[PDB]
Amino acid sequence: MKSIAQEHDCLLIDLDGTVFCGRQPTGGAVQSLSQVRSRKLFVTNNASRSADEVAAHLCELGFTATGEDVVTSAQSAAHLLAGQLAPGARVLIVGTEALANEVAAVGLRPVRRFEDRPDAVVQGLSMTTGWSDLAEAALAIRAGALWVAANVDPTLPTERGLLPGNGSMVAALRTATGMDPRVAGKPAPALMTEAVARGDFRAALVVGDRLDTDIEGANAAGLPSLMVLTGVNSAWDAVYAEPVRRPTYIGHDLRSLHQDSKLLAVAPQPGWQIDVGGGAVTVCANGDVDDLEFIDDGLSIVRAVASAVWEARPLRIEAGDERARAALQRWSLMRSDHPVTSVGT
Amino acid sequence: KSIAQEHDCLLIDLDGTVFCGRQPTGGAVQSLSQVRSRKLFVTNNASRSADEVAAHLCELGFTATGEDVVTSAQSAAHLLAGQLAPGARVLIVGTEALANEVAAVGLRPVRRFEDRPDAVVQGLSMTTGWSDLAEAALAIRAGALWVAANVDPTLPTERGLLPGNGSMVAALRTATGMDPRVAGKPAPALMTEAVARGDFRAALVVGDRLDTDIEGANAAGLPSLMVLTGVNSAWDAVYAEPVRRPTYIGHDLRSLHQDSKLLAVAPQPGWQIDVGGGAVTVCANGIDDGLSIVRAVASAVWEARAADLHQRPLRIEAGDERARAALQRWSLMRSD
Ligand SMILES: [Ca+2]
Ligand SMILES: [Ca+2]
Ligand SMILES: [Ca+2]
Ligand SMILES: [Cl-]
């Protein structure tokens, strides 16, 4: 009767494929959020832009947001460091002035080179970061500096294609030093716990499309999650997800915010009978062949299969009739490592 | 009859071997001035031009020209020319010296993905940044052929160990999921190209680093002389896996004027060795430049461990006080 969005006093919406499709907002995103009355907080693992800059770009894209609605990993990385370093302690910045400013804001002293004697290194993406900047960081790390990364995402999605992410720049430093950083952003629960503490919200919901950041982060933070299937492998990835990466709910896109949570939950489904046995999970359709009473948002079979697989090397997804067959293939759940498509790329 | 007199040309590693930082290695200048075989100076770095590297050598007191130097940039260029059509566009990550070596083999150096490269070549430049890596990552993902000058994780300097080409390669591997072809040491082509340069029949590699100089030499089918002025120690030589084992060991470049029989890793008259009970145990009984015991110990360990199987390291022990002092000099014993 109520929508899932109405069951929550705030939404932590991931700023990845969940809301952006490169150039434009994702299909249905702006319309859906405009009808949400609860607080909308936009959370990003990107530490390159200030909260205000993120908000301005969101507005440009047709969304409504101010800096107060944006939470970034620059902020959580600064808090992580400030919680274990002394007041005024020096921190070498790899990244933008936005990152440096977040460090300054929590009582620490941002610094740009090894000879300035940093106690720590904080690393976020900047498109002007270069070899010499990394050389300063490598010296600091070798001399025992605490090393915090905003995220370890290998790529940065853009219009041009997939470019090196902060995770790529971390890898260079890992090769140079033999060390790994501590990650302040997702999947660490602090970013989300900080978002919730900002407005003292009591019934928060995580909304995102990445199992290893959004969903794992949510589970780590003890919050429920709505996973949206933005990618071709999202359905498959959900089904085969390890326990800490399992979402509470599964939706197609942000239209799901106005659907009933009971319909969205990963659970057994009335339209699908599942038989688990002999290394396989076999799915059969329930109604008469021309019965449409069980067709709702199209994702009921994914919820069914995920639920059967979660309650226990990997099980094979198999069809027990024509309808299951077509519905499994719609969600690319029938594979021989990749789903066969009509035209190959 | 010295070891240098037994070879057409010497493939001499630069840093750690010829010089260490600001200074030439002990006796290097005099020893090289008296060798009459061809001296090629060989470097895994692709940042500096052959002329720049020669200029540096001159500044330290070694007369050398551009033609006496072999770089990874040159090896990378040759590799590209063997895989690409003439005039093919190659995106450069690294210095203009690298871009020029690519042009020199008839390829077209380029900087952007929009220039539609067929390949990416990667060497270190201290001005390479995110934007440069972004361009190369696009090319690599779209299927461009990817060559790396070297895959060394670090670059040693006056101020410490800084990020090397291998670190920058690691960034692109993470961004793309792809892996480059490696042009420099220990890939043998760098060295087997250097011998072609003069059609030499009996070359010798000289270097300090087991995982580049010596591994490269063995892959190239060339014999090798390890010096101890650089990265690796006598301990490291003893425990070197089969692919990184040198033919000869000496203190420094003065060894080029010693008899090759004296330098060879092999049994020695002065040192009796018993292998067994998890130990190599050494006794004295019966020329020495001081490395005789190391050559004896390495030979025994290598003979006992023919293949790179994950086996228990043999411990090195003394059966008398003479062997104890000599083993301790090279840090070949363990205590608690
Ligand atoms: Ca009602
Ligand atoms: Ca219906
Ligand atoms: Ca060397
Ligand atoms: Cl290089």
Swiss-Prot record, chain B:
The active site is at 13 (nucleophile), 15 (proton donor). InterPro entries: GNAT-like, HAD-like_sf, HAD-SF_hydro_IIA, HAD_sf. The keyword Amino-acid biosynthesis does not apply. Keywords: Glycerol metabolism, Hydrolase, Magnesium, Metal-binding. Coiled coil: none annotated. Gene3D superfamilies: 3.30.300.290, HAD superfamily/HAD-like. Although Co(2+) and Mn(2+) support eight- and fourfold higher catalytic efficiency than Mg(2+), respectively, Mg(2+) is likely the physiologically relevant catalytic divalent metal ion. Its cofactor is Mg(2+); Co(2+); Mn(2+). One of its GO terms (molecular function) is manganese ion binding. It comes from the Bacteria. Disulfide bonds: none annotated. It catalyses: sn-glycerol 1-phosphate + H2O = glycerol + phosphate. It holds the Pfam family Hydrolase_6. Signal peptide: none annotated. Mg(2+) binds at residues 13, 15, 208. Pathway: Glycerolipid metabolism. Disruption phenotype: Deletion of this gene results in an accumulation of G3P and G3P-containing lipid polar heads. GO terms for cellular component: cytoplasm. GO terms for biological process: glycerol metabolic process; glycerophospholipid catabolic process. Crystal structures of Rv1692 reveal a unique architecture, a fusion of a predicted haloacid dehalogenase fold with a previously unidentified GCN5-related N-acetyltransferase (GNAT) region. Although not directly involved in acetyl transfer, or regulation of enzymatic activity in vitro, the GNAT region is critical for the solubility of the phosphatase. Belongs to the HAD-like hydrolase superfamily. Dephosphorylates D-glycerol 3-phosphate (sn-glycerol 1-phosphate). Is the final enzyme involved in the recycling/catabolism of glycerophospholipid polar heads. To a lesser extent, is also able to act on glycerol 2-phosphate and D-ribulose 5-phosphate, but cannot use D-glyceraldehyde 3-phosphate, dihydroxyacetone-phosphate, UMP or GMP as substrates. Homodimer. This is D-glycerol 3-phosphate phosphatase. It comes from Mycobacterium tuberculosis (strain ATCC 25618 / H37Rv). The lineage of its organism: Bacteria, Bacillati, Actinomycetota, Actinomycetes, Mycobacteriales.
